[PDB]
Specification:
The complex is a heterononamer, with three copies of chain A (about 350 residues), three copies of chain B (about 110 residues) and three copies of chain C (about 120 residues). Chain B has about 110 residues and is mostly beta strands. Chain B contains no helices and nine strands. With about 120 residues, chain C is mainly beta. Chain C has one domain: Immunoglobulins (Immunoglobulin-like), CATH 2.60.40. In chain C, β3 and β4 form a beta hairpin. Classes of the chains: A alpha+beta (about 350), B mainly beta (about 110), C mainly beta (about 120). The interface between A and D is medium-sized, with 40 and 25 residues. The complex binds a molecule of 4 linked components (NAG-NAG-BMA-MAN) (3 copies), a molecule of 3 linked components (NAG-NAG-FUC) (3 copies), a molecule of 2 linked components (NAG-NAG) (2 copies) and 2-acetamido-2-deoxy-beta-D-glucopyranose. Chains A, D, E: Its main location: host cell. Chains A, D, E: It is found in: Host apical cell membrane; Virion membrane. Chains A, D, E: Belongs to the influenza viruses hemagglutinin family.
């Protein structure tokens, strides 16, 4: 063993303070686990046809598989990570329908790129408003928040590939959307242009969200290219989070979930992975040392280069790791020394 | 639902000739434009006018169109030999479930 | 010549130079020596087919995405159904009373019903 | 007391190393304290009628009360936190008037939603330019920086509720603003639309700022919807900061200000609050341990969910707290042990 | 020397554990050093005429001098720091030409503000497309990625000073650019307006970048104001970084580069500078203590006030410094104590 | 009938279907058998009232925000002031020499001055 | 300040009749439009034309307007019985403190 | 009067109230009693001078940025070159077949070639 | 390359006079506008019309222009004494390396 005074002291018995292996499965207990299968969190939020089983569900940890794929209308979400983290921290997909007026337009649009049964469909939580008898009047719709809790609204804008398509769907070539509340406003203008085809569709959809406080009112003023919401999600606070892992779900008990299965949380340090959920030991770089409950955290792996923000995140996590490794080393040394001293 | 049109018109070549399409409060009268189609005998109908004054590429400027109130008018500045075809007027009817309405047709001579 | 009470199917190609993602296909009928009539239409990539009220119950419209075709079938034919059928593609233009115009592609198909 | 070798050792005397209580008042000395009363920092910057007493004042700590409210034209500030932090770190509200030309337009617009005396008024530091005899010529105005210090300019854009209102104020329906310097440019386009009414006003105003270095020139090119500046603020660097607290201001002396009054800074650790100003003890989670001067810092409490950035900030502060708690524990243990050893 | 039990113990011999001086030169070995002279990294990336010697070069550390200046068309880069960090981390300026069609327009535009020889020139890696016989047809150009590596594309938008200039270059007054890939889209609209003149030019250029994954396709759809790319850069990952320093390049060996020359890396702590590259000792605030390989990191000095992000970065670095200073102090104390004990 | 030297106050409602936040109210006078004349105007939510130079010193315009009314008072009446007074609301349109047009609401108020 | 207008005009029904509004270098001549108002006897004045050619909803297309130089013209394509009202022309005068100027009025018969 | 085979240089100022960053300068020739002819042109801040094919090899265009001038020189003069030369500035307007129009500044310069 | 123009036209003052500029498939016929220049004797040529209907400030509304097919027309509503100048028409030729083409010139009398 290692001590402050002597780097190599032989002792009769010793124990390992670093966990280096994993079970290989997620224990499914005591935390509530929701397996996403082929669905991502955003796809389950929007109402992808293959994710219809995730409606109104709740979770403590959301598991995203690398096999996940989208099978609906192509879309992109500005500030995707922020919305994903918000929904993951909320920890519920509970949905409540609201009766918006939407007078003078057609409702419940369907696309051939989104197949639910044998026919065309669309996102279950989104409403595609189009022309009615080749007319599209301006919409002035309101919805007040008379409840005691916050409301989350998900809406979208549609970007056609050509001007012909614009006219063919909205009967006019100039659309604009303004969604406002007493303390916020968001103005979005569609960008008509050609884009690479996904499932034969060159068009795209951009997703935006709005939060309404109790006593506030939501106002939507649009002239076209609007993907309306059908209701609101209840947004709360809790110990929920999201994790990317390909490990199978088992049937056991463990208070610490790692991407590589569940790990025992008896030892004070571990080196399996820096991504942890629940009551977990501290992560250190040391592979062997011889003698905390965080829930939602920051993202620690990135598949794309982004620059400043990602560099700062990496720097933060590196600093944490290095300081805790120093702490571990010093602690082990001190304890070994004091034990040697007290046994002589 | 159909739009009233004169059965036929005739005249010597070289002068203006007018055709009319009269509508109701649901078509043309409900802020809807009128399209004009041309069908030479033994051929599929072609497109002559849209938007009440727009001419597609390949149509001489001799053809003109106008709309006023619940009526529309088609005009040819100079009659020629090739103007032997039939003309139809098309609008949209908002009543009931909505449909595309065509005129009764006319014959120019 | 089709026997009375049989079915007639007219196919059309939902592709071309001017065809876009959200272009539509409409069917037009013309009796011999008479005017033009409008039948059902469909957008191959959006919504459900529309139908005229005169033909309700007898007409069906199907979209074949593998071969990029659209077919219209008319069940329980009658002697008055002898006519020429045309495909039309929808055109777009900027206006205030805008409604799509019809672009006739190719020549019509002649269908005659007799016993 | 606790030691490394023994967790429970009885000693004749011991002292507490963690401060757990507060006086309940802000001592007003030696730091310069500016009580905001009903006014926020941004409202005092813009010139709210009820904040006219804050003109040209200086501070070391700015105190924001939860009772603060706005009583002028409705407005929103993109990147509100950045501007608030900038002004708080500057530490002064000194203002110098400049003579911009503004030829061909009307000056000194007033609104019924902003009442100063018995008549309509507006922000004191902002100029509302409107039509002159129902004409609005294009503006090409310049202002050079011939001084030895930086200049801060605050300007705005006006978003009317309807096109009628647009015409009624600016005589034309297409406004655009471009504010540029030799090393920067900012283009803003108004968004006409209806919004929920605050003090019967559906329109809004967006606030932007521009910094001009010595030897540089400021150029403004506008055609409408411009809220012009009347001058510049002097922006400097110092130990100033801003704090949210409802504690009353007293008359005492203390080098450490916490949201909950001032606290004595004799002990090395404390647990009252993680938000501190001046020479303060380190914050730890331990409520009892038995035996640094930072000024402006990051925001540690949030009233709205924002996502990525707020998660990173929380993670940083959590890491800091946990590491300093470990340090505290280890230090106390070591000192106790060594003292026991040296007394035997 | 200092010990835990006694603050002042006299010993026969002692050593210094903190490096406080620098050689004053960059050793040029073993790391690959690229001296930028009068050129910045972005200027070398774009192809400034005075930076033509930096084409297709590679580096481990890029040195930026304060004497650097631009001598070409005025430009600005939104998210300048992100692009700079991306290029610095890539560590190479290798360029591969691609044959875009660009049919119906004029190519290879030149400006009097960018002089390469005795005649007008432009950026070497950018293509300025203009009217051909006073016509500018819409461009629909594609480029697939059939390789096994990512591609980096640099393009730009041109903002003229007046509408006359717009027409004089593009023959029409309404330009728009859309650059898209199967997983991304970027829409940019030029802002015509007057700006302060640099080298007699009031116009500006904005720079954007796009990354294409293998198996993806790049599509550009433009109607004017497009600064087209001539090819792609190979973007990789490595230990490369960028440093601002005015120290001369020498001929020696050192595994630690500081802004102030190279420093010996035998002692465990140093206080010369917080900015380090390579195997360097930890930075501490202590100037005297008596008895790690990071590569790319975050920016630790700022010349402009930015707010939230810069505050967070400063807070992170301050926390790191303070914790490592505490670690250093405690370590020195412990070692001194144990040595005193073992010698008696 | 008002005695000479007295005051006359005409009230008007600054509300309606076409009234917006920055709409204005203008007063127009018409002598019996003569043309139209322009008097002061005010925007209830912006600026200060404007006045015609012929009426300076005798006319005042007040805005009552609690009842959403606007009043115009004319002091030191004279025999030539016998006329009918109209309220007008400002209209907006896109042009290049644009100036607001007047929308007359209701019928005028008859005021007669005699001894 | 007032704008000159003919005292009265008259004519038989069924033909075009013209009214003129002449201005100065400060109104109409200073890039200002002209509005036209209609007042039937015993009624408040109404709005007929604005923007020199724009007609509000509820006005027949028989009325036309034009502006040239420092003058403006109002035209009625077909005189009818209900055209017994008076017509006024309005502009803005930029001189002095600025004001709204009306024409002297005209009587159609 | 210039001797045959000599050179003639015409200078022009690339500045003014209407001149912008990307305005151009074009040269026009007019023989006595004949029509207008187009010669080379250049944008002082962009590209390279263009030339007419009739004058290739004999004409050169230079830009002097210090004095903000532009000069056109014609080498190997001939008797038929007796004409008046004009500077023109390019104008811009919104259209669909747009090409710059010529703004003639000042009076022309008379050049005569004789032996 | 030049554009064909009538050598001269003449007429009494006070009536409309027309001038024509005929082009080819490369100029005017290739979607290119036509400019009109005016040259009084003993003076540098001025600018009269651009964009086929636009008049610069300082030109009376008596001058009008139009373009149709591969031809263009200039019109003067009222001939006056000062209309003694010559007129040129200008277009762009896309053939070969491209150039600016002028008309043969005309004389009005
Ligand atoms: C801007 O440029 C892009 C890129 O070219 C362009 O998108 C392209 O559109 C064409 C359609 O015209 C796409 O071509 C199709 O590709 C699929 C493969 O996914 C093929 O299966 C299709 O085959 C059909 O056409 C064949 C023609 O011979 C037939 O033989 C066959 O039976 C099918 O009918 C078809 O070739 C092409 O994939 C895209 N390119 C992309 C998405 O990158 C876009 O349209 C342009 N914008 C415009 C013109 O406005
Ligand atoms: C888009 O939709 C919004 C939402 O409807 C709309 O804003 C609304 O405007 C109306 C005005 O028409 C506001 O109604 C007022 O509300 C206040 C309360 O703050 C009432 O005190 C007002 O009372 C007046 O009207 C009564 C009518 O009976 C009178 O009896 C009374 O004496 C007063 O004169 C008035 O009702 C409404 O509050 C807002 N809604 C908001 C702000 O959420 C907006 O105008 C629409 N955009 C358009 C039409 O362009
Ligand atoms: C909006 O406003 C800006 C600010 O005024 C304006 O930009 C200005 O343009 C003028 C050109 O008209 C610039 O003036 C030049 O400045 C340089 C110095 O860099 C001088 O050397 C130039 O001298 C020339 O002109 C003199 C006139 O007497 C001659 O004597 C001399 O020989 C030269 O020919 C010239 O004065 C001015 O620097 C800028 N200002 C800036 C860039 O801040 C812009 O044009 C306006 N926008 C419009 C009008 O659309
Ligand atoms: C054209 O409009 C008709 C009528 O729509 C109905 O009447 C409107 C005034 C409005 O109240 C709508 O909400 C109504 O639905 C459309 O016909 C309707 O189509 C829907 C869709 O299947 C059907 O549920 C309704 O029963 C139909 N209404 C009737 C009276 O049959 C028609 O689809 C529109 N055509 C288009 C948009 O191309
Ligand atoms: C219409 O314009 C007049 C005139 O404004 C003055 O002249 C302009 C050319 C310009 O130089 C302005 O700055 C001048 O003020 C306005 O009358 C002025 O109103 C202001 C505001 O109270 C007053 O201080 C001036 O004394 C007035 N000028 C005179 C000569 O009396 C008038 O208000 C404008 N009307 C509008 C905007 O509706
Ligand atoms: C006007 O266009 C000519 C012709 O350009 C050529 O033909 C086009 C159809 C297209 O294929 C272009 O790429 C061709 O270059 C321009 O003349 C050319 O100018 C370039 C530039 O130096 C030269 O390399 C070519 O040889 C020239 N072509 C010929 C036939 O001589 C001309 O410059 C254009 N004028 C402008 C843009 O003002
Ligand atoms: C905001 O909402 C208002 C009210 O619905 C819209 O105003 C209408 O705009 C149309 C188009 O110009 C007019 O024909 C109507 O008369 C307007 N109604 C009213 C009551 O003013 C407005 O267009 C909306 N704005 C947006 C961006 O959607
Ligand atoms: C930028 O400033 C210039 C100069 O003031 C503006 O240019 C004027 O624009 C108007 C409107 O088109 C023209 O009538 C003038 O002739 C222009 N003046 C000059 C000197 O060119 C321009 O509009 C401004 N741009 C913006 C966005 O405000
Ligand atoms: C470029 O495009 C034109 C027409 O768009 C085409 O004829 C040509 O072949 C293309 N270039 C190449 C190299 O294929």
């Amino acid at each position: 063993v290692k001590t402050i005074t002597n780097d190599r002291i032989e002792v009769t018995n010793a124990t390992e303070l670093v966990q280096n292996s994993s079970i290989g499965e997620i224990c499914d207990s005591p935390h509530q686990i929701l397996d996403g299968e082929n669905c991502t969190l955003i796809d389950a939020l929007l109402g992808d046809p293959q994710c219809d089983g995730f409606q109104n569900k709740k979770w403590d940890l959301f598991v995203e598989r690398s096999k996940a794929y989208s099978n609906c209308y192509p879309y992109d979400v500005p500030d995707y990570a922020s919305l994903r983290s918000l929904v993951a921290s909320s920890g519920t997909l509970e949905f409540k329908n609201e009766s918006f007026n939407w007078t003078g337009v057609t409702q419940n649009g369907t696309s051939s790129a989104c197949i639910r049964g044998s026919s065309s469909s669309f996102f279950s939580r989104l409403n595609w408003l189009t022309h009615l008898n080749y007319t599209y009047p301006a919409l002035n719709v309101t919805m007040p928040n008379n409840e005691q809790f916050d409301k989350l609204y998900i809406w979208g804008v549609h970007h056609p590939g050509t001007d012909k398509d614009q006219i063919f769907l909205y009967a006019q070539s100039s659309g604009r959307i303004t969604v406002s509340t007493k303390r916020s406003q968001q103005a979005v203008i569609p960008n008509i242009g050609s884009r690479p085809r996904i499932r034969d569709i060159p068009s795209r959809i951009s997703i935006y969200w709005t939060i309404v406080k109790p006593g506030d009112i939501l106002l939507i003023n649009s002239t076209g290219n609007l993907i309306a919401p059908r209701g609101y999600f209840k947004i709360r606070s809790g110990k929920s989070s999201i994790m990317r892992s390909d490990a199978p779900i088992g049937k056991c008990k463990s208070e610490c979930i790692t991407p590589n299965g569940s790990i025992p949380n008896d030892k004070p340090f571990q080196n399996v992975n820096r991504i942890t959920y629940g009551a977990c030991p501290r992560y250190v770089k040391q592979s062997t040392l011889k003698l905390n409950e965080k829930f939602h955290q920051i993202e620690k792996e990135f598949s794309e280069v982004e620059g400043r923000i990602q560099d700062l995140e990496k720097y933060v996590e590196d600093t944490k790791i290095d300081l805790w490794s120093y702490n571990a080393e010093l602690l082990v040394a001190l304890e070994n020394q004091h034990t040697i001293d007290l046994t002589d | 639902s159909v739009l009233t049109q004169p059965p036929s018109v005739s005249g010597a070549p070289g002068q203006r000739v007018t055709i009319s399409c009269t509508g109701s409060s649901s078509n043309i009268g409900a802020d809807y434009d009128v399209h004009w189609y041309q069908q030479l005998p033994g051929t599929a109908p072609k497109l002559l006018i849209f938007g009440n004054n727009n001419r597609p590429s390949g149509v001489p400027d001799r053809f003109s169109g106008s709309k006023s109130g619940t009526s529309a008018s088609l005009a040819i500045t100079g009659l020629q030999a090739e103007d032997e075809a039939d003309y139809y007027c098309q609008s949209f009817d908002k009543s009931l479930s909505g449909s595309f309405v065509f005129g009764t047709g006319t014959k120019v001579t | 010549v089709k026997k009375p009470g049989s079915s007639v199917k007219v196919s059309c190609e939902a592709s071309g130079d001017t065809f876009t993602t959200y272009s539509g296909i409409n069917w037009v009928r013309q009796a011999p020596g008479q005017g033009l009539e409008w039948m059902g239409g469909v957008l191959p990539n959006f919504g459900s087919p529309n139908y005229a009220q005169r033909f309700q119950g007898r007409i069906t419209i199907t979209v074949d995405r593998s071969t990029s075709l659209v077919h219209m079938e008319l069940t329980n034919l009658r002697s008055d159904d002898t006519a020429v059928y045309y495909c039309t593609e929808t055109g777009a233009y900027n206006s205030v009373g805008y409604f799509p115009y019809f672009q006739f592609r190719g020549q019509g198909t002649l269908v005659s019903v007799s016993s």
